[PDB]
Design an enzyme around this catalytic site. Sequence first.
Site, PDB file in Angstrom:
ATOM      1  N   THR A  63      43.975  67.220  21.536  1.00  0.00           N
ATOM      2  CA  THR A  63      43.876  66.255  20.148  1.00  0.00           C
ATOM      3  C   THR A  63      45.822  65.995  20.394  1.00  0.00           C
ATOM      4  OG1 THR A  63      44.498  68.476  18.431  1.00  0.00           O
ATOM      5  CG2 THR A  63      42.265  67.016  18.869  1.00  0.00           C
ATOM      6  N   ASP A  99      35.737  47.973  43.666  1.00  0.00           N
ATOM      7  CA  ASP A  99      37.074  48.014  44.447  1.00  0.00           C
ATOM      8  C   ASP A  99      36.876  48.110  46.076  1.00  0.00           C
ATOM      9  OD1 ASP A  99      39.625  49.519  44.548  1.00  0.00           O
ATOM     10  OD2 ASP A  99      39.501  50.144  41.856  1.00  0.00           O
ATOM     11  N   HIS A 114      43.323  52.584  46.580  1.00  0.00           N
ATOM     12  CA  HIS A 114      43.457  52.489  45.144  1.00  0.00           C
ATOM     13  C   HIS A 114      42.471  52.701  45.305  1.00  0.00           C
ATOM     14  CE1 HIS A 114      42.301  49.767  41.753  1.00  0.00           C
ATOM     15  NE2 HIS A 114      43.666  49.773  41.308  1.00  0.00           N
ATOM     16  N   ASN A 174      47.585  44.661  33.708  1.00  0.00           N
ATOM     17  CA  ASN A 174      49.263  45.277  33.858  1.00  0.00           C
ATOM     18  C   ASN A 174      50.083  44.420  33.549  1.00  0.00           C
ATOM     19  OD1 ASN A 174      47.721  47.336  34.471  1.00  0.00           O
ATOM     20  ND2 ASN A 174      48.571  47.894  36.362  1.00  0.00           N
ATOM     21  N   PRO A 187      33.435  40.873  25.816  1.00  0.00           N
ATOM     22  CA  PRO A 187      33.806  41.507  24.761  1.00  0.00           C
ATOM     23  C   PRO A 187      32.814  43.130  25.258  1.00  0.00           C
ATOM     24  CG  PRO A 187      33.445  38.959  23.811  1.00  0.00           C
ATOM     25  CD  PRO A 187      33.471  39.407  24.880  1.00  0.00           C
ATOM     26  N   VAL A 208      31.782  45.115  27.046  1.00  0.00           N
ATOM     27  CA  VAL A 208      31.799  46.087  28.132  1.00  0.00           C
ATOM     28  C   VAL A 208      33.060  46.500  27.562  1.00  0.00           C
ATOM     29  CG1 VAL A 208      31.331  44.660  30.078  1.00  0.00           C
ATOM     30  CG2 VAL A 208      33.668  44.587  29.771  1.00  0.00           C
ATOM     31  N   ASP A 213      38.776  48.027  23.742  1.00  0.00           N
ATOM     32  CA  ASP A 213      37.935  49.095  23.244  1.00  0.00           C
ATOM     33  C   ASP A 213      38.977  50.391  22.791  1.00  0.00           C
ATOM     34  OD1 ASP A 213      35.190  48.088  22.900  1.00  0.00           O
ATOM     35  OD2 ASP A 213      36.346  47.857  24.700  1.00  0.00           O
ATOM     36  N   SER A 221      44.572  50.550  35.817  1.00  0.00           N
ATOM     37  CA  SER A 221      43.552  50.488  37.170  1.00  0.00           C
ATOM     38  C   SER A 221      43.051  51.962  36.956  1.00  0.00           C
ATOM     39  CB  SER A 221      43.758  50.416  38.222  1.00  0.00           C
ATOM     40  OG  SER A 221      43.573  48.910  38.752  1.00  0.00           O
ATOM     41  N   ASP A 237      47.672  57.869  18.007  1.00  0.00           N
ATOM     42  CA  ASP A 237      48.022  59.372  18.820  1.00  0.00           C
ATOM     43  C   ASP A 237      48.861  57.896  19.430  1.00  0.00           C
ATOM     44  OD1 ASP A 237      46.493  62.737  19.144  1.00  0.00           O
ATOM     45  OD2 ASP A 237      47.062  61.711  17.391  1.00  0.00           O
TER      46      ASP A 237
HETATM   47 CA    CA Z   1      34.557  46.112  23.990  1.00  0.00          CA
HETATM   48 CA    CA Z   2      46.950  64.003  17.486  1.00  0.00          CA
END
Ligand code: CA
Ligand code: CA
Length: 279
Positions: A16, A39, A69, A161, A175, A177, A200, A224, A260
């Site tokens: 956490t 990839d 990569h 990025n 949306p 995925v 997400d 990535s 966080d």
């Molecule tokens: Ca989504």
């Molecule tokens: Ca926390």
Amino acid sequence: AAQTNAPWGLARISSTSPGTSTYYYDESAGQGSCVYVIDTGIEASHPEFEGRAQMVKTYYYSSRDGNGHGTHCAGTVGSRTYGVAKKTQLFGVKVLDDNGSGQYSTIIAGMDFVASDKNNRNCPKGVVASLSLGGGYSSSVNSAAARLQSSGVMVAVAAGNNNADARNYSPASEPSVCTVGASDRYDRRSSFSNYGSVLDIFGPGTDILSTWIGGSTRSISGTSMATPHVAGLAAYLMTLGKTTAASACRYIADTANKGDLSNIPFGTVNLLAYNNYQA
Ligand SMILES: [Ca+2]
Ligand SMILES: [Ca+2]
């Protein structure tokens, strides 16, 4: 299970709070799940993959990962030392050339390939696909990622990025995925990470140590690198029976560390992937 002195990202997704060093995880470790890494390929002979990786499709002259990569991302999904889901099966689909670049038509083909190929594989705990790739917005790229998800694969994709809104990038902007932003070891949004309403979830993306070609290792940064943390986490949670390919992104958001992260713009989720592991 506990992996001491783990890469900070593995430690982060089992805590956490930031700043821990041990990766705590259920020993099932993603066994029985399958993750397609779409990839530059995977160096399946890398000892870190323990025989659990194999190339299944290439769109280039060779199936060799000439770049690193894809081997790095695959290692964050499922290598022994650097992976989230240390017992998953990894399948490489080489849609990107050895410079890391690839045409959208080839990327789409590789997504359609995975949607069909999974029907020939024994993946009793379910199927994930990790897409650490993307470019400008394309409705056909988004639709291919939507099809892959609809076919029953948990699709995780990099947010990009560009330090910009991911609505202008694909497949990030699809949306349906799981679009993944990047954070750093101090729980800041990574400086390069895209943001926006379509994200997400965030995962560790800055200074991520993993496998590299030539049987080596290295630490690189990007959305990535965050994406395979989420793909690996999905595979891990699917093996645990806690979620399904259709629901894993929502489950990961449901169960994330909330609030966080710093430097999250208003309207972007403040959610950091978290495995909620309790011994
Ligand atoms: Ca989504
Ligand atoms: Ca926390």
